[PDB]
Amino acid sequence: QISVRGLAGVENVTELKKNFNRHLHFTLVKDRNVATPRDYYFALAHTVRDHLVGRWIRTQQHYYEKDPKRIYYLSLEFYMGRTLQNTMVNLALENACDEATYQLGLDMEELEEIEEDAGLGNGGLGRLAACFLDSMATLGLAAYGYGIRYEFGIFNQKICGGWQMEEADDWLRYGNPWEKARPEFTLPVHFYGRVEHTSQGAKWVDTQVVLAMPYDTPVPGYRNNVVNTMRLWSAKAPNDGYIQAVLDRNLAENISRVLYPNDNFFEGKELRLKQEYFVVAATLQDIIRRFKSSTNFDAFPDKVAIQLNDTHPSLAIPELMRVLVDLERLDWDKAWEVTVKTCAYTNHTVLPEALERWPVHLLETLLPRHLQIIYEINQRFLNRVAAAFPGDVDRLRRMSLVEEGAVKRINMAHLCIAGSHAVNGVARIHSEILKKTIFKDFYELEPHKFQNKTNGITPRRWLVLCNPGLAEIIAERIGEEYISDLDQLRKLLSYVDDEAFIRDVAKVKQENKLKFAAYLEREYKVHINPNSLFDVQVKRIHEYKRQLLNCLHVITLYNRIKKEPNKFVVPRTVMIGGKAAPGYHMAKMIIKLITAIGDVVNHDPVVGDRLRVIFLENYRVSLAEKVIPAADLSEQISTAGTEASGTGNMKFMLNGALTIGTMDGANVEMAEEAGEENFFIFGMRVEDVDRLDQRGYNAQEYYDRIPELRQIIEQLSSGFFSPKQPDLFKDIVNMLMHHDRFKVFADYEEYVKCQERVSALYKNPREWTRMVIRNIATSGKFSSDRTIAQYAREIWGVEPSRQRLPA
Amino acid sequence: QISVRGLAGVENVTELKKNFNRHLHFTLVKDRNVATPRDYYFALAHTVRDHLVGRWIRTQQHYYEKDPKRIYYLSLEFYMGRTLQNTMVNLALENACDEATYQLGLDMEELEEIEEDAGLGNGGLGRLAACFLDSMATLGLAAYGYGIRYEFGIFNQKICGGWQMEEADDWLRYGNPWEKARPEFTLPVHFYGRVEHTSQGAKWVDTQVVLAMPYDTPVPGYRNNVVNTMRLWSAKAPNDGYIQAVLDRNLAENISRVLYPNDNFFEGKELRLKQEYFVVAATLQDIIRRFKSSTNFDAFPDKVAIQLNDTHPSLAIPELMRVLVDLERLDWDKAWEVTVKTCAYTNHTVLPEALERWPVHLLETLLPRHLQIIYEINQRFLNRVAAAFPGDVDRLRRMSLVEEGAVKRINMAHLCIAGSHAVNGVARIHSEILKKTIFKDFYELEPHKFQNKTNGITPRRWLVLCNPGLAEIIAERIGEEYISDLDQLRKLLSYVDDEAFIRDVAKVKQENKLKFAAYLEREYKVHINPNSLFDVQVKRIHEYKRQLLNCLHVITLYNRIKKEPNKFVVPRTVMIGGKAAPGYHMAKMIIKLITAIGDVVNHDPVVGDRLRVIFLENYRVSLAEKVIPAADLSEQISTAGTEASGTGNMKFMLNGALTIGTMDGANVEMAEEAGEENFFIFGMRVEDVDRLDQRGYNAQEYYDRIPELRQIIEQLSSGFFSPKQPDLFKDIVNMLMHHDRFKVFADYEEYVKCQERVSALYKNPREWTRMVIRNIATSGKFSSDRTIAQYAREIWGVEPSRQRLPA
Ligand SMILES: N=C1NC(=O)[C@]2(O[C@H](CO)[C@@H](O)[C@H](O)[C@H]2O)S1
Ligand SMILES: N=C1NC(=O)[C@]2(O[C@H](CO)[C@@H](O)[C@H](O)[C@H]2O)S1
Ligand SMILES: *Cc1c(COP(=O)(O)O)cnc(C)c1O
Ligand SMILES: *Cc1c(COP(=O)(O)O)cnc(C)c1O
């Protein structure tokens, strides 16, 4: 149908139909009379998977022959979403499969909806790892993603009576056709025990053993025949009254059972620590095995890079030291040099509650030898600090890996900086914040370590896959090369006055909105005006992200309409979605507030179809692929200094929405790329937030001086949005008035004014679309191909390549 | 190579090689450079599995079109063993696959050894169900085996310091290529809750739900293109703080986690009761669904037969009543008629400790509605008894389903008899014992219900598969038809004086013994004389089976040699193997005694290679396939009246061993078929045991009057076989002298004398072999094809067929 989806060659289509029928018969053991839509999905998945296999085997043997430096991306989260369409896109099989399935009397898009998301992440950090794997494969890097194969991923969210309920995400229930179990590469992981000091050195003994069984998933590059591996570990009990002993195997296997559902919040639970060590211990043995199968560990950093995704895999540092010192018998100083040159650390947030600080008593019991190694690292590190800054005793305590207090804790971020040759933030403003505030001491000691690597998103999933209509009209003008060279979108600036292109851009958006409006009615029986401005905020629910600020604007619009009902206003559909961590009460109250506002606004006859408020249930990767292409306005409204980067922001920019946002995270760079005239910027800058903190934030001041704000708070308190439970939102009001860390009231006036300017521009379709074209055209910097190329050249010391392997 | 293994056609071999390479590449994602022997096994298994699929689909659609009466064999155990070779044998693919793999540079027998046993049974009862599935498919019956897919089967036995250690049988670790998950047929099973009585009847409410997910395994008939299904249920939690809630899903899923390892012993544990209801509830819903997809339940017994394998699935009776009365709204009397005509019950033992008697308080809590239905059944049943035998109040209490006492219990055997139209024992003597003793009251009320169905074994697995050499020399004389018509072996009687046949029979045995003697040295580094008489007792370790009587003989032989070292004796290798239930102390002591005797006997220089005692570790189906063909003497020495049938006995008879045995179980019929002159019969008959019980068994009498026996007991007590632990076997001696339920001493003299006659005959190879030929020739009755044909005609009301479906 459309060119960017590839060729539907007669032979290809014939062969796909044949192999589809083969799998339906031999693999699924079905015939067309009893086959369910799910059977058809699986037959297609197996058919597409067959085309990966040759390339996968050839890629891995190519790496063995050439022996390039290997990149190991360690993460507790990989938010992959669905795999079928992505694989077709990267293998240029989409049109052929569409044709093949059409000839068999099937609708391929219907089959695609059957696939479960691989929801092995919480949000942005997990999704970044997924985009990164795609870009590493597309750039021909010998890269491996290493993580945990959670039996249960991020919970499915149901909304009951306006409240979030959590349901287990049993994503493996029907099987996963993409993974290949590799039980032959099973490795032991040790826990507990004690340290014995001998003549030959330290020995870690009397441990409990859990087995780590790997499952490999292929990661195809974009039309380059490279297929890399994501290896995820699953916990298995070793095979050594009777019934209870067998049942108790569950205890060991619980390590890989479930993803911790906390976004930007540290929970110091033992099971989480076990997960972190489990992935690190299994992965490092695998790395070392692969390295030896190429004694001389001097060359280890030349053949191995380990990227630590946040501090979650920080135990890699002392584990690598443990193996090199206790098992390989290297001297400490040599082992340390190898470790530092091998490891690099990426920080993803400065929120204090997100920082991992593990109680010493936990490490003492679970990982006694690692604790010893951490103390040794700390002593040697602090000796360097003392030598560089003689007499500065407070710096010593500020920089220590060990935090003193009620309970002693290890600061894992400090461990990561000490043990890595490179430390990066994920957007320019964030990386500057790291050097100026939380890691200032470390920057002063080792400034060469500190870098920036601004985040990105893969344009395969986030344009070609989710928005083929837009990909096509772009390709019609500038060709297909931009899909793996997103900077080429700049060429679209010469079409900003092109009447045909303006018309096409606007038509594609309208089509996307109609499709999404239909999806809502079918799957959720809710009716929306497709001619309204689609105002979308989708991301995890958190105070710092300020869904509450959005809520205040929505209530402002509602109150203004009620005050002057017969005055024209630009119709809006305000869509908010995202999951709250199960134990985060305020986030759950925010979800309830949004639905409560919807209940009032959506049933007020005077409002009509001029304002609608919808809570998008179960926001996840597959839903992002639907809603983002349909959005007109992207809400990126975190308090300045809190969103390290954001990546949702980049997705909306690429898909033809305009952005209303603070100068926070990557928004700063997005505005810089597009021009501030083409961005709806409002609110405090970081410096303004600092000034307010110095004199003290008093929310009452804003309440006292802004009558429209006062009205809203009075409505909330009095039970306007909760008639039968008048005090339901008192916690929200109390927080806003007395304990608001994120200064919601301080940005309210500028936000509302800025939103009026959004409405003004939307009334002029042509100028709206021209500004959109200016955004899409300057979105190139935010390709994860650019991000990964920078990691490769500036941290890993390897050169990317766009050359293809033989098919 | 040999004809009974089928044709190796050039096209077949070419196609098998092609599909093998296809699976290695696409299914296993390997190439020949990195492929492990296990990968090669899986490639072959998938290749052979492909040939089942068409036949499997066609068989099931054939049953749908013809709508024959369906047979449902309900069992908690299916001891399947390995599947690869069996499938090849039944599809006539063995030689073709051997050729194909040979041309690829692989040894097929080596690949076969990689497959794990499906050890979903304890021993004889579980293996009977497996043989029965094979025969039902071979006889073209529309039959389904229904059970539980245990994650862990019968434990792997290791011997450490002469003691049994148990290891978890993680049989699914590398995957099971034979099964197909059918998540679309998942069914809810209910537990706990309470009964509510309404105007519309009883309602079972507030239950906890566990999901039952079926996995289907194909069961191929012998070269008839029939492929039936064994459906095994796996327990799954439904999808509805957070972390602990997810982890607690394990509790529901524990139902299908592990096989209870008790052989002939009832353990009244709640988890076991849950397993029993789980299989029954899921299976009956599946049966009813299939029945409705052909309201009028009058025809239910014409289209459905349910065979209860022991009392383990006895809850089928009240569950069927529950569904018919509570859900389908049939009146009680009609529901009962349907239930009785649908259900039939097979009793497998009379040992009192094996009988299921469930505490009422357990049923009350777990299955409150079933308890109510059981009481109602009991009241109506006892009203019939009272009417038939007026005034006989003791009969009423003897026949009650409810047993009074300290704890009230339900007698599940009584429930089964009341609710079934047919009750059978498993050998003629056993069925007579049922009518004369334990179910005498029931027989008097309903004599028409009571039947015999003498057990059998499948000659596919137990001759063609495990002993191709013997199958071939038989086929050379009388053709191949005997493999599905075992009565044709009678034709071998006309070769009993044929010098060539005598030579061939003896050569095949010698070859089997050499092969097994080699297996011992390779896998267990133990050296045995292959010219010795192979004296084998393999079966679960139990007092009633009297491994101890064997031990007494072995020590007698040893003492006689030590007394007259330079006298000639027929050399023997005495092999004993089998598992003990983990909580059965005496059985574990027996294993320790056997190894302790071996330690002394095997290292005594004066004995030399004249006597060896070996404990066969980890006795299981795959080991039975090796040792049984190598055996000369089969030990079947249970106390008369205790072994309901035995089936190991039949396996040895078919494979050219002579039998030393009591007149117990099927031994009686085996002796009857072969002639008592061709059997080594010894010991008390049932009537003799009864006489001894009447006057009281005094073991001291035998100790006092048999000096050879006295010496052995003195050796045991004094520490001759345990120097460093002199009193190790005091429990054994104490039991033998004072608390021996199985009268070991009473059969000692006759056993030893009988064993002397065995040795005498073995010294005359020609006459030994002629007697062997007379056994093999009369083994036809003990084909499970004969057994199943009798079930079909006399219980299920269906006609077997040897006609083949189209290929
Ligand atoms: N636990 C986190 N989750 C995120 O999304 C974080 O990482 C993302 C990827 O770098 C960033 O874009 C987000 O700003 C940050 O909150 S940190
Ligand atoms: N729990 C049991 N295990 C058996 O082997 C039993 O059933 C077999 C099959 O009918 C019989 O051959 C055995 O004699 C009997 O012990 S009963
Ligand atoms: C991109 C993405 C995120 C991150 O969005 P932000 O707005 O940057 O927080 C979260 N969840 C999903 C499902 C995503 O696709
Ligand atoms: C046949 C068989 C049995 C039953 O043997 P008996 O001697 O009848 O108790 C037990 N275990 C296995 C593995 C078998 O193959």
Curated annotation (Swiss-Prot), chains A, B:
Record PTM N6-(pyridoxal phosphate)lysine, positions in chain: K651
Modified residues (Phosphotyrosine): Y192, Y215, Y443
Keyword Nucleotide-binding attached: yes
A Gene Ontology molecular function term of the record: pyridoxal phosphate binding
Modified residues (Phosphoserine): S3, S400, S484, S717, S718
Domain of life of the source: Eukaryota
Cofactor(s) of this protein: pyridoxal 5'-phosphate
Pfam families linked to this entry: Phosphorylase (PF00343)
Enzyme class name: transferase
Protein's job: Allosteric enzyme that catalyzes the rate-limiting step in glycogen catabolism, the phosphorolytic cleavage of glycogen to produce glucose-1-phosphate, and plays a central role in maintaining cellular and organismal glucose homeostasis.
Similarity-based family: Belongs to the glycogen phosphorylase family.
Annotated positions for site Involved in the association of subunits: C97, C131
Post-translational modification: Phosphorylation of Ser-3 converts phosphorylase B (unphosphorylated) to phosphorylase A.
UniProt GO cellular component terms: skeletal muscle myofibril
Protein name: Glycogen phosphorylase, muscle form
InterPro entries membership: Glycg_phsphrylas, Glyco_trans_35, Pyridoxal_P_attach_site
UniProt note on regulation of activity: Allosterically regulated through the non-covalent binding of metabolites, being activated by AMP and inhibited by ATP, ADP, and glucose-6-phosphate. The activity is also controlled by post-translational modifications including phosphorylation.
Record-listed AMP binding positions: D31, Y64, R289, R290, F291, K292, S293, S294
Site (Can be labeled by an AMP analog) location in chain: Y144
